Amino acid sequence: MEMEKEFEQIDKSGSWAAIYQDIRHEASDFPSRVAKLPKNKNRNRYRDVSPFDHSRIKLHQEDNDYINASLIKMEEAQRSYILTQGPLPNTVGHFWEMVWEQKSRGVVMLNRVMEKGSLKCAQYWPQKEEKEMIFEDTNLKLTLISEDIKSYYTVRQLELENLTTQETREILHFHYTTWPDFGVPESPASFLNFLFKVRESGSLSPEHGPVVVHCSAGIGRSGTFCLADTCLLLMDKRKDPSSVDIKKVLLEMRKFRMGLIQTADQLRFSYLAVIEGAKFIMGD
Ligand SMILES: COc1ccc(NC(=O)CN)cc1
């Protein structure tokens, strides 16, 4: 069923809450035993959001390999993503260790550091060129090289140095700066524009490690980004939007991380973004 007609059918019947609960009911349930170990309690932002054991990212250290991060591997689309929580004060060094070890070229941030007067994530990157950050626990140095500010998003060029070997790499930071907490973007237009910028950078391409994507919990806004990208890519591979079932793609992604898409409104927005984005893929 053309999703654009499935969309109008759900809208006119006001059944978004009903579709969403059906997904919640059919979603995979896998063990998260490492996340729940007592030694890891201060590595988790939210007690109810944990990576599955089978798909969790392992840190390359003997001490404690744990981070709240999952590998989402989309076999037909040939895209991979790492979805992770907003870093905590004690996990900013783990965060940059993961980017280094996984060979990522992009970090995608969909939240502000403050929303609702609570810190949704640590200030984990430098704000001024001349004030670099050193992560003593993981032996990394991070420097701001350049910043480009637009109205609702900013891009940054960062330099990450492995202080152990003195190798350096260029990391691109894509910061979507106007997406409300457990909300939806102002318009499919600004979201998709932002998406088409990450895609142009090379950050999603198979020559690099997987893109790191986060919000506060790494499931809601983060879920919407990878779901829209994969659905549009599938359209591209088969040049046939008719063939894509957004609900089936979401359940496939939920085999690798729990809770992706946190509200019925986030599900409705995901449909809107894919429908409007398709008007580019099919040749306009
Ligand atoms: C901060 O703004 C910039 C972002 C990226 C670059 N370099 C690239 O290679 C992007 N494809 C340069 C400046």
Tell me if residue 231 is catalytic. no
Provide the CA 146 distance to its chain's centre, in angstroms: 23
Q: Which long-range contacts (CB under 8 A, 24 or more apart) does 186-194 make?
A: 186/152, 188/269, 188/272, 188/273, 188/275, 188/276, 188/277, 189/276, 190/152, 190/153, 191/224, 191/228, 191/269, 191/273, 192/228, 192/273, 192/276, 192/277, 192/280, 194/152, 194/153
Q: Is 243 exposed, middle or buried (0-12, 13-18, 19+ CB in 10 A)?
A: exposed
- Discontinuities in the chain with C to N beyond 2.5 Å fall right after none
Name the residue of 109, 125, 127, 146 whose CB sits within 8 Å of the most ligand 1 atoms, as the mutation to test its pocket: 146
In the reported structure, the alpha carbon of residue 157 is separated from the centroid of ligand 1 by a whole-number distance in angstroms of 6
**Residue 175 in contact with ligand 1 by CB distance below 6 A:** no
Supply the residue whose CA is at minimum distance from atom 8 of ligand 1.
201
* Strand partners of residue 148: 155
> Amino acid identity of 36?
K
Q: Which is the closest atom of ligand 1 to the Cα of 201? A: 11
Domain count, the chain: 1
Which experimental method was this entry solved with?
A: X-ray
Supply φ then ψ for residue 227, to 5 degrees.
-65, -45
DSSP-based three-state secondary structure for 261: coil
Nearest CA to ligand 1 atom 12: 157
Residues annotated in the binding site, as ranges? 181, 215-221, 262
Ligand 1 centroid from CA 150, angstroms? 14
Distance CA 132, CA 84 (A): 24
| 172 Cα–ligand 1 center, Å | 7
Cβ(138)–Cβ(93) below 8 Å: yes
Separation CA 169–CA 158 (nearest Å): 8
Contacts (Cβ under 8 Å, ≥6 apart) of 3? 241, 244, 245, 246, 271, 274, 275
Are the beta carbons of 270 and 228 closer than 8 angstroms? Answer: yes
Task: Give the annotated binding-site residues for substrate.
Answer: 181, 215-221, 262
Q: Which residues are bridge partners to 174 per DSSP?
A: 108, 155
CB atoms closer than 10 angstroms to residue 118: 8
Cβ atoms of 212 and 108 within 8 Å: the answer is yes
Residue identifier of the C-alpha nearest atom 11 of ligand 1: 201
Please work out whether the CB of residue 166 comes within 6 Å of at least one atom of ligand 1: no
CA geometry: angle 115, 178, 74, nearest 5 deg:
100
The residue whose CB lies within 8 Å of the most ligand 1 atoms, and thus the one to mutate among 127, 154, 157, is 157
245-262: burial string, b at 16+ Cβ within 10 Å, e else: ebbebbebbbebbbbbbb
End-to-end CA distance of the chain: 22
Cα of 89 from ligand 1 centre, angstroms:
27
Ligand 1 neighbourhood includes 156 CB (under 6 angstroms): yes
Q: Could you list the residue range(s) of the whole structural domain that residue 142 is in?
A: 1-284
